[PDB]
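> run fold Ubiquitin-like modifier-activating enzyme 1
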Amino acid sequence: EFGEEMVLTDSNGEQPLSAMVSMVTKDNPGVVTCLDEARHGFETGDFVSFSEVQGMIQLNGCQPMEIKVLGPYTFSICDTSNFSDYIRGGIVSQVKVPKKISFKSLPASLVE
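> ok
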């Protein structure tokens, strides 16, 4: 809230990777399924945030959380029961919490 506007563009070139949410399962650990195109780019132990989630609005209104990828399109999170009931929609995006200018083990290096 407003912080989105009042926040540093610290995300340098890196924009959050966003994915289409297929379904979210009200369970703990919570498990959700993403669209085949929903190439999330999320990493196990990575942090993500949600948007446009229906029913499970808690995610929309929740800070980013740690996630664990069960499969390529299936990931698991804290407790969906601590969110709400999933209706439809839902956009999920990874948020690698802001870092000080530093060298972190980058994701599989790009080949060109």
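The chain has one domain: 1-112.
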